RNA sequence: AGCUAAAUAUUGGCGAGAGACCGAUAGCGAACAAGUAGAGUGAUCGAAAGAUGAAAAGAACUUUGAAAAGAGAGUUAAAUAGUACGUGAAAUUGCUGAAAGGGAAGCAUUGGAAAUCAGUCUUACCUGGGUGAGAUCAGUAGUCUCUCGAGACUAUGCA
RNA sequence: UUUCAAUGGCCCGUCUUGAAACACGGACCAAGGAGUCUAGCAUCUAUGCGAGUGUUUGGGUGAUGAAAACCCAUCCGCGAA
RNA sequence: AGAGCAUAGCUGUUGGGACCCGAAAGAUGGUGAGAACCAUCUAGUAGCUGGUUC
RNA sequence: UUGAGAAGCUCAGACGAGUAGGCAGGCGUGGAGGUUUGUGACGAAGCCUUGGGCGUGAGCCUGGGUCGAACAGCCUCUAGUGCAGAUCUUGGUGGAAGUAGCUCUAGCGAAACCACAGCCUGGGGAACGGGCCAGG
RNA sequence: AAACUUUCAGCAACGGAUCUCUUGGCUCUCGCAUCGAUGAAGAACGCAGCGAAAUGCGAUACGUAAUGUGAAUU
């Protein structure tokens, strides 16, 4: 059984390898570590035991190679408890008599899965800035649609225009602090 | 079209573009003679066919303010979020401009740049987890009336939020086109004056709360001696923000024959308004006086400011 | 699955049958869905179009439109309505093609030869 | 076990720089007479062997984390038990829709990644 | 369309084409190179000079088998020639910019060649693409301050 | 002296269905005009050449020019899609900016200068009290699904 | 990355011959471009069965794709007696 | 007191155009006017030449 | 003590030129079966880039820009599967050169050739020279 | 200095690679048997739409009649 399927799974297919440069991972939802390892494949373990999270709740999944053929009733789950040092000792008390090693993965998962849950409660407080994705099509329609419109403003026609005219209109005092003589005099002859 | 040869489909285009440049041409060669010897008709087409822009072809709404002073849009104002300004007690604008968190040197070297062009503002590094509204009812509390925040990511400023206090409206721009003084061809010194301001094109409605948000930024009673003038623009929904230094001087085109000369001071960016929101910035439980909607944009002819 | 050796799966050949059709299958191959009314009152689901049905536009940038159907373009593919246009660059109005499977007929132009057909395909006229 | 390369340069494939036909991907030469192949002096090094980098710190990242491949929020949360051991890097082809996802999830499981910025802008 | 240069903002600056030019590309070149930077009405005068014999191009760069000319002492060269294909086509672009700023409402006693580019066509002998931006002098402003 | 179906063959002809085939310098010479244009007295020889866009909406109008065209505009989600039309590499060319210049040169090693870039942040952890909260806590009542108790919930209380 | 300073540093491929040298090929760039398919024979390895072994000339059969897969009557090849 | 048969892969080897390319054969059938020219047999060839891809 | 991909983990010592030739392990490309409850108009593939990183290397990942419809990792199968050369094929484009030409000119306008630079005296034994060494 | 030369970068040309596409080719398999003196294959000349360097047709000249489909051709 089990040493068949880790000669078949193990090295020849599994879907749920990732291959990597240093060490391939399995993309299953039971293993412990996450990495593909004869002691971390739940196939190829019969007795396999880890910790997974639900809607912010652990569990303590277990399964036995008495159940290997009926897979809906193939893992059982007992919920762990929310103190820490008490899901140390249901973890202990759940897997009792199992090898330490399997042990030793439930409680490295607990941990992790523990950090996990409290980081995700302080994101939650915190308060941190929205992602907004950058899209291609609206850039480059508001890119070039800015460049007509910065053309058709005119704006150091406009800024003129609208400096002459404030001038005419005599917005400052009697004589203005911006012009000079041969400026103000002009302007006096003209819009008078 | 009907032609899937490569070659046989472009001689006839180029057959075809021939022979519509010739009759466009006799067209117009023979416009002219009889133009020529009728000038009433050159001035019945000139005065009959003139030429189409965006402008001319925008989509009509019915918010643009009228030229005609009206009591309903006076009397809104004479209370409004802003009426310390424009009123008779003439409240002095001071602004706090500040960044997000953990700003490099490429905001700062534009923020001294807008620090420049805004007299009387002050500028604090955003420290720790302060936010937006608690940096506002902190502020309201210091004598600050306008607050200016500097999103940037990645050394590039992109986004600017701008909070009236204590309870104001809250404007929020995407930034553009950031160029400084030095990346500006022919730039000049800025002094210490108070700039003149120059606001153009904002007719419709919601032009107006935007452009009463912008000048409000700046002291009442400008320095004319310093010959400074600080515009903003719309043209198309976009804000353009330039800063000049100018004289005047005789211009033998303009017909008045005076026209002034301009040399920029910098800085100088557009801006798009994205949001508009009343009360305090928060873009989670905000209330939402305008969203732009980017599938609206897409009509080159229809405009909001 | 189609089991038929006489229809050919062939993506080279339903290509070509459709883009080198003659007019009298064209025919066919611009039909439109009867609006739910028409679908409960002639038992037929869907209609070849013909000039002056009158159809609604279910989807482009021209949903919602309504208008009697003008001209049925079959070298094109293409249906034109009655006021769904574009204006162009000298004031003209280009009308603007809309595919026959993107409108639904909301009234149909009967005559003998459409009521015919309707009884044809098992419908109560 | 602290980060060391043995080399820092790439091994340019001789030649290459003189002709724009020959790119510069290293191949290895078999002229007799050359003087590259002969191992002269002041010619380029070839790759050896003893160049390799220590197996302990191979594929590791300047501040010691490997850079694993991420597509998808599945593949974040795969790095739940090597968090202090590998970084994601989400592929360049997920859309901006997904890397918002991943980089909510990667924070949360206190994963670092490399190229979380992209495609995105912020809002606070 | 768009130029070789980040100049011709619509404000201050116009623009003039030619492409497929039936004219030389490497006379074309060299006429490009002597009256850029001129004012418009200096670069007109000059023109009309080369059509006079009056003044001389110098050829610069592709300067083999031209003869040297008193002429080019002003310019610091030797080698010069009279093309007169490549200064009339530069001359009908210039009268084109110049219509086009008077059309912009720019000042007309102020502007100068900013940018002038030559480009090869595609071989149909060897055509010419050629681009002309003038623009205003741009003036300091006074700080009095 | 003679006839004779079937099982058999089949690069042609009339059709049909396929493919671990080629993907426009490939696959027929020919994805388009193709045994065509063209070459030769003739027998014969024989190419190159595919792609705008969803829609021509193929750029009205004003203006310069003898014209070709240009420039203001205008259409489009995009003209960094304008029929010389998807994408647009290299060789090569022009302009602009910076730097280096005296002949084996490029190149290799090491640093300087200038320009530019990368990531690494204190924030959490532990502990104490107060205030409220809720369940995986009730000297607690019910339902559902599995195998007494295991998960999921529903009320009620917060010691 | 560009450049500078100090040190070093020849143009590759082929052929030649003792290595050379020399003589050949190379203006540049892109694309294309050379141990392939098949029939025998022998070796080694793997696999199935084993004094046996080999279904596919052919027949049966395949309801959904049917040129596949599945089944095998009589011979026959090699091996052995 | 039999050890073979079948399949697959590898390697070597012998044939087929047989790693690619490079000299004209010769013959058959035509065209034009001895000689010339055209098309197929025909991938008839180079004891060699040049090249032969991480 | 958890360190059983037993094809894993671990400890120790020695060694390291290399033509012909031999033997292993890998990288990349087109297509096929399976798989990733895979990536993609919120932008696939390609291309550009003095952005960053990984591998001794073949190569691979990634940021930005451009772009607009498809594409990839892993296990296996398959082959018209990887170029700097062939006085290689096709196409494109250079210097010669605005030269030869049809004083200065006006228009039109080539081709051969091209590994690459280019001041001399001596020596570098196989020419050493132009290319090295020592000098002017 | 300037020029020229050289290098690097930006923009603009030139060029048409790459990618994606495909009413085409190629290969295999399957069914079928049908030219002509009642004028064939092929060639030429016309016709009318055209873009023909394409197609259809034959002075009844994109064909006419008949059977249809049923409102277009573009």
Same mark, same amino acid.
């Given at each position: 059984?089990?040493?068949?399927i880790?000669?078949?799974?193990?090295?020849e297919?599994?879907?749920y390898?990732?291959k990597g440069?240093?060490?391939?991972?399995?993309?299953?939802?039971?293993?412990v570590?996450?990495?593909?390892?004869?002691?971390s494949?739940?196939?190829?373990?019969?007795?396999?035991?880890?910790?997974?999270?639900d809607?912010g709740?652990?569990?303590?999944?277990?399964?036995?190679?008495?159940?290997?053929?009926?897979?809906?009733?193939?893992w059982?789950?007992?919920?762990l408890?929310?103190?820490?040092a008490?899901?140390?000792?249901?973890?202990?008390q759940?897997?009792?008599?199992?090898?330490?090693?399997?042990?030793h993965?439930?409680?490295q998962?607990?941990?992790?899965?523990?950090?996990?849950?409290?980081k995700?409660?302080?994101?939650a407080?915190?308060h941190?800035?929205?992602?907004?994705?950058?899209?291609?099509?609206?850039?480059?329609?508001?890119?070039?649609?800015?460049?007509?419109?910065?053309?058709?403003?005119?704006?150091?026609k406009?800024?003129?225009?609208?400096?002459?005219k404030?001038?005419?209109?005599?917005?400052?005092?009697?004589?203005?602090?911006?012009?000079?003589?041969?400026?103000w005099?002009?302007?006096?002859?003209?819009?008078? | 079209?009907?032609?899937k040869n490569?070659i046989?489909?472009?001689?006839?285009?180029?057959?075809?573009?021939?022979?519509?440049?010739?009759?466009?041409?006799?067209?117009?060669?023979?416009?002219?003679?009889?133009?020529?010897? #009728?000038?009433?008709?050159?001035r019945?087409?000139?005065?009959?066919?003139?030429?189409?822009?965006?402008?001319?072809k925008?989509?009509?709404?019915?918010?643009?303010?009228?030229?005609?002073?009206?009591?309903?849009?006076?009397?809104?104002?004479?209370?409004d979020?802003?009426?310390?300004?424009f009123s008779?007690?003439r409240?002095v604008?001071?602004?706090?401009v500040?960044?997000?968190?953990?700003?490099?040197?490429?905001?700062?070297?534009?923020?001294?740049?807008?620090? #420049?062009?805004?007299?009387?503002?002050?500028?604090?590094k955003?420290?720790g987890?302060?936010?937006v509204?608690?940096?506002?009812?902190?502020?309201?509390?210091?004598?600050?009336?306008?607050?200016?925040?500097?999103?940037?990511?990645?050394?590039?400023?992109?986004?600017?939020?701008?909070?009236h206090? /204590?309870?104001?409206?809250?404007?929020?721009?995407?930034?553009?086109?950031?160029?400084?003084?030095?990346?500006?061809?022919?730039?000049?010194?800025?002094?210490?004056?108070? /700039?003149e301001?120059?606001?153009?094109?904002?007719?419709?409605?919601?032009?107006?709360?935007?452009?009463?948000?912008?000048?409000?930024?700046?002291?009442?009673?400008?320095?004319?001696?310093?010959?400074?003038?600080?515009?903003i623009?719309?043209?198309? #929904?976009?804000?353009?923000?330039?800063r000049?230094?100018?004289?005047?001087?005789?211009?033998?085109?303009?017909? #008045?024959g005076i026209?002034t000369?301009?040399?920029e001071?910098?800085?100088?960016?557009?801006?798009?308004?994205?949001?508009?929101?009343?009360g305090?910035?928060?873009?989670?439980?905000?209330?939402?006086?305008?969203?732009?909607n980017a599938?609206?944009?897409?009509?080159?002819?229809?405009?909001?400011? | %699955?189609?089991?038929?050796?006489?229809?050919?799966?062939?993506?080279?050949?339903?290509?070509?049958?459709?883009?080198?059709?003659?007019?009298? *299958?064209?025919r *066919?191959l %611009?039909?439109?869905?009867?609006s739910?009314?028409?679908?409960?009152?002639?038992?037929?689901?869907?209609?070849?179009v013909?000039?002056?049905?009158?159809?609604?536009?279910?989807?482009?940038?021209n949903?919602?439109?309504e208008?009697?159907?003008?001209? *049925?373009?079959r070298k094109?593919?293409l249906?034109?309505?009655?006021?769904?246009?574009?204006?162009?660059?000298?004031?003209?109005?280009?009308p603007?093609?809309?595919?026959?499977?993107?409108?639904?007929?909301?009234?149909?132009?009967?005559?003998?030869?459409?009521?015919?057909?309707? *009884?044809?395909?098992?419908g109560?006229? | 076990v602290?980060?060391?390369?043995?080399?820092?340069?790439?091994?340019?494939?001789?030649?290459s720089?003189?002709?724009?036909?020959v790119?510069?991907?290293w191949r290895?030469?078999?002229?007799?007479?050359?003087?590259?192949?002969?191992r002269?002096?002041?010619?380029i090094?070839?790759?050896?062997?003893?160049?390799?980098?220590?197996?302990?710190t191979?594929?590791?990242?300047?501040?010691?984390?490997?850079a694993?491949?991420?597509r998808?929020?599945?593949?974040?949360?795969?790095?739940l038990?090597?968090?202090?051991?590998?970084?994601?890097?989400?592929?360049?082809?997920?859309?901006a829709?997904?890397?918002?996802?991943?980089?909510?999830?990667?924070?949360?499981?206190?994963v670092?990644?490399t190229?979380?910025?992209?495609?995105?802008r912020?809002?606070? | 369309?768009?130029?070789?240069?980040? $100049?011709?903002?619509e404000?201050?600056?116009?623009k003039?084409?030619?492409?497929?030019?039936?004219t030389?590309?490497?006379?074309?070149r060299?006429?490009?190179?002597?009256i850029?930077?001129?004012?418009?009405?200096?670069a007109?005068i000059?023109?009309?000079?080369?059509?006079?014999?009056?003044?001389?191009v110098?050829?610069r760069?592709?300067?083999?088998?031209?003869?040297?000319?008193?002429?080019?002492?002003?310019?610091g060269?030797?080698?010069?020639?009279? $093309?007169v294909?490549?200064?009339?086509?530069?001359?009908?672009?210039?009268?084109?910019? &110049?219509?086009?700023?008077?059309?912009?409402?720019?000042?007309?006693?102020?502007?100068?060649?900013?940018?002038?580019?030559?480009?090869?066509?595609?071989?149909q002998?060897?055509?010419?693409?050629?681009?002309?931006?003038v623009?205003?002098?741009? &003036?300091?402003? $006074?700080?009095?301050?």
């Amino acid at each position: 059984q089990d040493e068949v399927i880790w000669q078949v799974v193990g090295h020849e297919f599994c879907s749920y390898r990732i291959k990597g440069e240093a060490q391939n991972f399995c993309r299953n939802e039971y293993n412990v570590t996450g990495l593909c390892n004869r002691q971390s494949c739940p196939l190829a373990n019969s007795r396999y035991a880890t910790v997974r999270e639900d809607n912010g709740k652990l569990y303590l999944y277990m399964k036995t190679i008495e159940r290997a053929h009926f897979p809906s009733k193939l893992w059982q789950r007992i919920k762990l408890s929310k103190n820490y040092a008490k899901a140390l000792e249901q973890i202990d008390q759940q897997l009792l008599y199992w090898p330490g090693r399997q042990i030793h993965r439930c409680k490295q998962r607990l941990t992790r899965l523990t950090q996990y849950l409290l980081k995700a409660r302080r994101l939650a407080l915190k308060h941190q800035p929205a992602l907004i994705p950058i899209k291609p099509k609206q850039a480059h329609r508001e890119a070039s649609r800015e460049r007509k419109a910065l053309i058709a403003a005119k704006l150091e026609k406009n800024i003129e225009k609208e400096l002459v005219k404030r001038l005419k209109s005599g917005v400052y005092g009697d004589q203005p602090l911006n012009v000079n003589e041969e400026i103000w005099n002009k302007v006096l002859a003209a819009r008078e | 079209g009907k032609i899937k040869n490569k070659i046989v489909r472009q001689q006839q285009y180029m057959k075809a573009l021939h022979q519509k440049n010739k009759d466009k041409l006799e067209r117009r060669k023979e416009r002219a003679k009889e133009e020529e010897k #009728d000038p009433e008709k050159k001035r019945l087409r000139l005065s009959e066919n003139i030429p189409a822009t965006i402008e001319s072809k925008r989509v009509y709404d019915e918010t643009i303010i009228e030229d005609k002073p009206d009591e309903e849009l006076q009397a809104e104002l004479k209370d409004d979020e802003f009426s310390a300004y424009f009123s008779e007690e003439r409240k002095v604008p001071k602004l706090l401009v500040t960044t997000s968190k953990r700003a490099s040197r490429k905001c700062y070297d534009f923020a001294s740049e807008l620090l #420049d062009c805004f007299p009387n503002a002050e500028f604090r590094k955003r420290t720790g987890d302060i936010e937006v509204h608690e940096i506002a009812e902190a502020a309201a509390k210091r004598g600050y009336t306008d607050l200016l925040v500097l999103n940037e990511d990645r050394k590039k400023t992109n986004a600017l939020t701008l909070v009236h206090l /204590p309870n104001g409206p809250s404007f929020y721009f995407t930034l553009s086109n950031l160029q400084t003084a030095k990346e500006i061809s022919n730039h000049g010194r800025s002094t210490g004056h108070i /700039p003149e301001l120059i606001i153009n094109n904002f007719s419709t409605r919601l032009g107006m709360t935007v452009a009463r948000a912008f000048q409000s930024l700046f002291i009442q009673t400008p320095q004319i001696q310093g010959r400074q003038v600080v515009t903003i623009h719309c043209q198309r #929904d976009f804000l353009f923000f330039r800063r000049h230094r100018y004289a005047f001087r005789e211009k033998s085109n303009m017909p #008045d024959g005076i026209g002034t000369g301009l040399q920029e001071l910098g800085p100088r960016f557009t801006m798009r308004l994205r949001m508009v929101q009343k009360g305090v910035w928060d873009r989670k439980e905000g209330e939402v006086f305008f969203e732009s909607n980017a599938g609206e944009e897409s009509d080159r002819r229809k405009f909001w400011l | %699955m189609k089991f038929s050796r006489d229809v050919t799966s062939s993506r080279r050949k339903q290509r070509k049958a459709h883009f080198g059709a003659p007019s009298s *299958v064209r025919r *066919v191959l %611009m039909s439109a869905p009867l609006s739910k009314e028409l679908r409960e009152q002639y038992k037929i689901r869907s209609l070849p179009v013909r000039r002056d049905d009158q159809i609604t536009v279910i989807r482009g940038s021209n949903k919602g439109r309504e208008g009697k159907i003008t001209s *049925v373009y079959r070298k094109k593919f293409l249906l034109l309505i009655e006021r769904v246009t574009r204006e162009k660059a000298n004031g003209a109005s280009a009308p603007v093609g809309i595919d026959a499977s993107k409108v639904v007929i909301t009234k149909l132009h009967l005559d003998k030869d459409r009521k015919d057909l309707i *009884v044809r395909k098992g419908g109560k006229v | 076990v602290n980060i060391i390369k043995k080399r820092t340069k790439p091994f340019k494939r001789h030649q290459s720089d003189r002709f724009k036909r020959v790119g510069e991907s290293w191949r290895k030469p078999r002229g007799i007479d050359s003087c590259v192949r002969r191992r002269f002096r002041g010619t380029i090094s070839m790759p050896k062997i003893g160049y390799g980098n220590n197996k302990k710190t191979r594929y590791c990242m300047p501040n010691g984390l490997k850079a694993f491949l991420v597509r998808n929020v599945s593949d974040v949360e795969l790095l739940l038990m090597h968090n202090k051991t590998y970084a994601a890097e989400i592929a360049g082809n997920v859309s901006a829709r997904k890397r918002v996802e991943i980089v909510e999830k990667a924070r949360a499981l206190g994963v670092k990644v490399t190229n979380a910025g992209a495609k995105v802008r912020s809002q606070e | 369309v768009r130029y070789s240069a980040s $100049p011709a903002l619509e404000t201050k600056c116009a623009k003039a084409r030619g492409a497929y030019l039936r004219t030389h590309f490497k006379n074309s070149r060299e006429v490009a190179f002597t009256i850029n930077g001129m004012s418009l009405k200096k670069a007109f005068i000059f023109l009309d000079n080369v059509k006079e014999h009056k003044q001389a191009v110098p050829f610069r760069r592709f300067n083999g088998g031209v003869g040297r000319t008193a002429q080019g002492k002003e310019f610091g060269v030797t080698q010069a020639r009279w $093309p007169v294909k490549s200064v009339k086509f530069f001359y009908d672009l210039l009268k084109n910019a &110049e219509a086009n700023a008077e059309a912009k409402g720019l000042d007309m006693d102020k502007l100068i060649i900013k940018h002038v580019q030559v480009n090869a066509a595609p071989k149909q002998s060897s055509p010419s693409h050629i681009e002309i931006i003038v623009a205003e002098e741009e &003036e300091a402003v $006074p700080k009095a301050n």
